[PDB]
Structure 1
Amino acid sequence: NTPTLDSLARDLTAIAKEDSLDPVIGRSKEIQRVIEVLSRRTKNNPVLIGEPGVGKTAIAEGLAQQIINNEVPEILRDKRVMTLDMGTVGEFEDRLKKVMDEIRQAGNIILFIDALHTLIDASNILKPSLARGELQCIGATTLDEYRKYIEKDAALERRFQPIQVDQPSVDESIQILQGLRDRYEAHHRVSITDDAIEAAVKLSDRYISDRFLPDKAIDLIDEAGSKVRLRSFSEVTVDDIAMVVSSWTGVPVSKIAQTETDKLLNMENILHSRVIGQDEAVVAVAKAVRRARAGLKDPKRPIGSFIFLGPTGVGKTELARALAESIFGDEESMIRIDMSEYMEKHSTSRLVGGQLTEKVRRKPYSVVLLDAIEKAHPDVFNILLQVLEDGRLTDSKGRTVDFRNTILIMTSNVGAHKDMKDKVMGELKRAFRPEFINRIDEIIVFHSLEKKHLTEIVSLMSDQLTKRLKEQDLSIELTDAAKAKVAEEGARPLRRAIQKHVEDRLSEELLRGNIHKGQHIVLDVEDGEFVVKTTA
């Protein structure tokens, strides 16, 4: 009796009559798996597990398609796949029980359920009707919600069945779209070039990361196919796709565009001139990343390891941030994990977790820095070792997190020239296992920490102090005689002395009136001592 349950929700074979839905691309093996499980008699009704937008319901749709055709065997022949409209159906229980009567009438109605966890209300007669049988259905939820479901293993694990449905390949998605690019280009009365499709996929998997394939790319195709239409009242290209991505995420279209194979040229300039000192160090790392990233090498591993050695507090973190800005930009690609906190062999628990795992989960397009790795322990050490092997860590859910374009840079002090060139390997092979060393991409070591470079940093720092004032208001200028007077200072933290000599003294003198706003405040050594003047 079609009336009632058709008033509940529309049938999928009704749509498949004219095949309104686009024919799904690929998934033939996964749909074959669905046919396998639906063929069984004990645990016959499956549940499709996957992230949202991966096209789990597309698999049920292609299933209804293969049902209309003959690909389906005979036992599953004559099976109408339907769904459930919770809205259109005191009395809803009456209508739903009527639906169950019709399910009992004809035992050939494979039902479909999206968001199965929040559905089983209806469970009151569905879960019972499952036990009795002949409610064979399909389920579409996430992973964690499938865990929430199997926590009802008592009466529900026996019947259901898992079918992991995952992202199509960044390659496969191209054929997906090329197959279904027809429908949208018809709708919008435009045409979509295939280079535009591949570019949309290549910017979706990289620069958005919030949603999943192929949802990302399909949305981009449709946003372009509406933008170009409104632009006319013809052909969509890479330009429009870069523009709509730039509108989405907020990055400049130019940085989306040119940086594919030419930013590597600017990178070494940035490294060479963003930190002062560590001359051969920037040469080393710059050479290194050009070997890995530009090179056709290390496909499985991440960009690779960089254990920074020498005195801690000379520019390691600053080199790291400069490199982050270089290769990925934003100065926000760098994630930091303070391994001094992991001085406990249980601390890895918070990894398995509000730590690097969630960080790389949020953005697989980033740099990662481990400082005070010496403070780690052999267990977290083996953890990061198998990571450096493949990046694949699995914490708190077995999440096979990928390390595609991350950077692994470890920082510590085993040093604490050539004699140092030897002692570094000495205390490495002496402080932990040699295999972890052997997963080298490159090892960056700077020994000297004091030079004229140091004074330059102070100059830079003085500039920063001027910056923040040109920000709010003032016109400070440190005469290089005074800069040298300050720099004549042992210990590295000279900014503290900057604060003392300049910031304090100036604030004391400004409070009492010897300075007012809108004045060019030149600080200079006139007799071997700080002197303030205003020029305005």
Structure 2
Amino acid sequence: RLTERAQRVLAHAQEEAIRLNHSNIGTEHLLLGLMKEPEGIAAKVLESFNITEDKVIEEVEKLIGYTPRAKKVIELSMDEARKLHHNFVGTEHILLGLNEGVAARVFANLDLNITKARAQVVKALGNPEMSNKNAQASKSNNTLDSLARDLTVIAKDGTLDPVIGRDKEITRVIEVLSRRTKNNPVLIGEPGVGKTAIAEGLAQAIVNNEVPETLKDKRVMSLDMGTVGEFEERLKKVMEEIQQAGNVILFIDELHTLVGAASNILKPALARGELQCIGATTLDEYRKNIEKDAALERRFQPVQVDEPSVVDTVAILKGLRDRYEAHHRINISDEAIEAAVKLSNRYVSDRFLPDKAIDLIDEASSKVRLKSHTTPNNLKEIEQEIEKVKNEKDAAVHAQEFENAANLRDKQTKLEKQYEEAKNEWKNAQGMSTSLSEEDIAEVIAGWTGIPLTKINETESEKLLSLEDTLHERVIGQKDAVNSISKAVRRARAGLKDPKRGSFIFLGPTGVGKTELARALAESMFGDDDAMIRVDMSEFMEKHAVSRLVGAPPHDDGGQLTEKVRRKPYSVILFDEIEKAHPDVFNILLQVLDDGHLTDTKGRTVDFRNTIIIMTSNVGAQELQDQRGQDYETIRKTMLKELKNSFRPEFLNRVDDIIVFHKLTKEELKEIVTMMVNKLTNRLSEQNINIIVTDKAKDKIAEEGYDPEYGARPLIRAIQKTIEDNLSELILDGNQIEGKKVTV
């Protein structure tokens, strides 16, 4: 039938009949629709000559204080289709149909059909705009108080200060009011980290008035969420007032309203279908609270960026790099910014990097600022010079010294003699200036984590360089397999695997570097081995696939490890004896191997690629006859086949690498025992005691305990069994201690 040009406002002038509830649908539905709001859309050009638009609004709005007269206005409006050389009829020739639509009284809003309206048709384009670019009928074309306090005017002071970077984000925010659905995005995750300062980005657009054509009217107010007998009847009061005033928005500041003094206070007024504002909730509180309603989970749009990304933080950081510089009184060599984002990026597994890196602006800036806080030892030596006798200088006044005389003015002259030097070298020595990286990185995370080693130094031009080397220092051997890994998930790093996507097999007996270099492995990785978690795949069989996958058909025995790592922000996993099982289970252990995570039943989808899992085998004592010195390719290919006997390439094509044991010898026995000596060097020679290494006893007992069954691990205890008891010898000595050395 009709078009988009202001039949828009006749469909919603039929909503103006629903708005204004009148038994004659009046021209003030056409015009109090056509004037959508009391804003100056006065932009109708006829407030020049005779009749004010706002005067029409007031007097016809007192007349209320298609109605076939105005259904003939539909006709006379369609009569204007050929009168002014058009295709179609536009937006204000409704009013050029509005003979009847006048407030014709003593103050008549009688409407000029010609008078200077023809000069106003020399004004309006007319025959250029027939219709339809999509439809080109746009805008200017041819208690009310501290209960809702704001920051909008406070930003419009300029006192609130510009954060930067969220152009697309605040753009999204603009798009949310373009919904017909969900007028807030509940920013989830870590809100208010700067996401409150994203709202400062929004009021920042208000003070800019980059805030558009339309949205300059309504404004952000800050809610008062505090306590009073009843708290809430006042709030129900102020609801109808400012909601009736209706030219603002507010926040839920922190909490969705689930309280006792009540929860459903004006949550029914929300449920009245009204009231565009902003809520507040997090990731799992979207998942709890907002989803706990599932009408909250209906009504708002969940959006976040986190406690955020990289160059976002570079943006807002180098933008606020003047503001918080007016706080912390230092300013930046931006390599500190680089290394800061870089390192707390590498670190913080449970909290997030960047508002914690704003907190690094706090810690590091507070650190240089605390070589920069209080009165400035040699200036304090000058203060000792200020600090010999005023605090006892004087009393010769009290009685008859002929002596007041001397020592009085001796120390008058003598101090003031020795004084203004303090001013001179003090104002000189009141340090260097900008916030350098090196030590306001190194010193400060040394104030947090430490050692400018694995905990700080760690540029991976260092450890990726000496990587294979470094772990090969720990448990020697398998260096082929070592940089088969260090190579292998070297190219997990530099992004060349999937960002959510690694498994490594053992070939030997336990604790030969299985326990010990799976140990020393993760202890090299992030400096600490504690991440790594065990199930044998002799253990995960059928209903440890139940206690691996939660029940309801067969209990909450699901996950021997699930709820732990579910709570954890970081872990590493090692599993054992894989083709001790059959090709059937390798699909559920392959379900561990999936997803860029695992799907068990309990809690959360996250990354894989930050750390590693590891596999282990021991069965191939048969192919040790192959070792009894055939190659990597021979025996790895042999138990790559014998591997593949039970295995699945879905499952195996989630495993990275076959990892050998170069079974070990008595020599590697001797040398990991030599590492055990270097342990006691590393711990108990910290009393810095010298060491007799008697190779009689060493190769004696080493010769003894080279276990065919157990390998090396238990013997280590069986070393110390005597040996550290031998230390007790030494402990009960206190004599062959630091600097000296005995054994047999």
Who is 2:734 aligned against?
A: 518
Could you tell me how far 1:447 is from its partner in structure 2?
Answer: 5.7
Who is 1:102 aligned against?
A: 241
- Conserved in 1, the CA contact under 8 Å of 2:251 and 2:277? yes
1:200 to 340, 344, 362: 340
Q: Distance in 1 between matches of 2:655 and 2:356?
A: 35
- Conserved in 1, the CA contact under 8 Å of 2:257 and 2:264? no
2:462 to 255, 262, 273: 262
Q: Tell me, yes or no, if structure 1 residue 383 matches structure 2 residue 591.
A: yes
Q: Distance in 2 between matches of 1:473 and 1:224?
A: 36
2:710 to 464, 472, 492: 492
Q: Tell me, yes or no, if structure 1 residue 444 matches structure 2 residue 584.
A: no
**C-alpha RMSD of matched pairs (Å):** 3.9
Who is 2:672 aligned against?
A: 457
Who is 1:47 aligned against?
A: 186
Report how many residues are paired. Answer: 508
What SS is found at the alignment partner of 2:527? coil
Could you tell me how far 1:408 is from its partner in structure 2?
Answer: 3.4
Q: Distance in 1 between matches of 2:369 and 2:712?
A: 60
What SS is found at the alignment partner of 1:369? strand
Who is 2:549 aligned against?
A: 348
Q: Which moved more, 1:79-88 or 1:65-74?
A: 65-74
Could you tell me how far 1:240 is from its partner in structure 2?
Answer: 0.8
Q: Tell me, yes or no, if structure 1 residue 166 matches structure 2 residue 310.
A: no
Change beyond 3 A, Cα 1:37–1:498: closer
Change beyond 3 A, Cα 1:111–1:451: same
Who is 1:184 aligned against?
A: 324
Could you tell me how far 1:462 is from its partner in structure 2?
Answer: 6.4
In the alignment, residue 452 of structure 1 is paired with which amino acid?
E
Could you tell me how far 1:466 is from its partner in structure 2?
Answer: 8.7
2:524 to 316, 326, 340: 326
Q: Distance in 1 between matches of 2:264 and 2:363?
A: 42
What SS is found at the alignment partner of 2:447? helix
Q: Which moved more, 1:5-14 or 1:235-244?
A: 5-14
Q: Distance in 1 between matches of 2:363 and 2:344?
A: 13
Q: Tell me, yes or no, if structure 1 residue 338 matches structure 2 residue 338.
A: no
Superposition map of 1:50-65 within 5 A: 50-52=189-191, 54-65=193-204
Q: Distance in 2 between matches of 1:405 and 1:510?
A: 42
- Conserved in 1, the CA contact under 8 Å of 2:481 and 2:659? yes
Q: Distance in 1 between matches of 2:500 and 2:335?
A: 29
Change beyond 3 A, Cα 1:516–1:56: closer
Q: Distance in 1 between matches of 2:208 and 2:649?
A: 60
What SS is found at the alignment partner of 2:370? helix
Q: Tell me, yes or no, if structure 1 residue 82 matches structure 2 residue 290.
A: no
Q: Tell me, yes or no, if structure 1 residue 308 matches structure 2 residue 516.
A: no
Q: Deviations over 1:507-536 (max 9, x none)?
A: 7x999x999543659554xxxxxxxxxxxx
Q: Tell me, yes or no, if structure 1 residue 111 matches structure 2 residue 309.
A: no
Could you tell me how far 1:301 is from its partner in structure 2?
Answer: 5.8
Change beyond 3 A, Cα 1:202–1:18: same
What SS is found at the alignment partner of 1:97? helix
Who is 1:402 aligned against?
A: 607
Who is 1:26 aligned against?
A: 165
Q: Tell me, yes or no, if structure 1 residue 237 matches structure 2 residue 436.
A: yes
Could you tell me how far 1:501 is from its partner in structure 2?
Answer: 8.5
Who is 1:10 aligned against?
A: 149
- Conserved in 2, the CA contact under 8 Å of 1:114 and 1:141? no
Q: Could you state the TM-score of these two structures normalised by the residue count of structure 2?
A: 0.60
Q: Tell me, yes or no, if structure 1 residue 221 matches structure 2 residue 361.
A: yes
| Bigger share in strand | 1
Could you tell me how far 1:154 is from its partner in structure 2?
Answer: 6.0
Bigger relative contact order, structure 1 or 2 (CA pairs below 8 A, ≥6 apart): 1
Q: Tell me, yes or no, if structure 1 residue 251 matches structure 2 residue 450.
A: yes
- Conserved in 1, the CA contact under 8 Å of 2:164 and 2:315? yes
- Conserved in 2, the CA contact under 8 Å of 1:173 and 1:213? no
In the alignment, residue 533 of structure 2 is paired with which amino acid?
R
Could you tell me how far 1:11 is from its partner in structure 2?
Answer: 0.6
What SS is found at the alignment partner of 2:251? strand
Q: Distance in 2 between matches of 1:23 and 1:463?
A: 56
What SS is found at the alignment partner of 2:358? helix
Q: Which has the larger radius of gyration?
A: 2
Q: Distance in 2 between matches of 1:45 and 1:52?
A: 13
Q: Distance in 1 between matches of 2:186 and 2:656?
A: 43
Q: Deviations over 1:189-217 (max 9, x none)?
A: 33223222222211221133443243022
Q: Deviations over 1:472-511 (max 9, x none)?
A: 999996632122332333333566567668736997x999
Q: Distance in 2 between matches of 1:21 and 1:515?
A: 67
> Which structure 2 residue ranges, 5 or more long, are not aligned?
1-142, 374-432, 551-557
What SS is found at the alignment partner of 1:337? strand
- Conserved in 1, the CA contact under 8 Å of 2:579 and 2:643? no
Q: Distance in 2 between matches of 1:279 and 1:488?
A: 25
Change beyond 3 A, Cα 1:291–1:125: closer
Q: Distance in 2 between matches of 1:393 and 1:448?
A: 32
Change beyond 3 A, Cα 1:397–1:59: farther
Could you tell me how far 1:106 is from its partner in structure 2?
Answer: 1.0
Q: Distance in 1 between matches of 2:264 and 2:272?
A: 13
Change beyond 3 A, Cα 1:203–1:467: closer
- Conserved in 1, the CA contact under 8 Å of 2:503 and 2:657? yes
Q: Deviations over 1:321-349 (max 9, x none)?
A: 223233432344x4223244433223134
In the alignment, residue 234 of structure 2 is paired with which amino acid?
R
Could you tell me how far 1:221 is from its partner in structure 2?
Answer: 1.9
Q: Could you state the TM-score of these two structures normalised by the residue count of structure 1?
A: 0.80
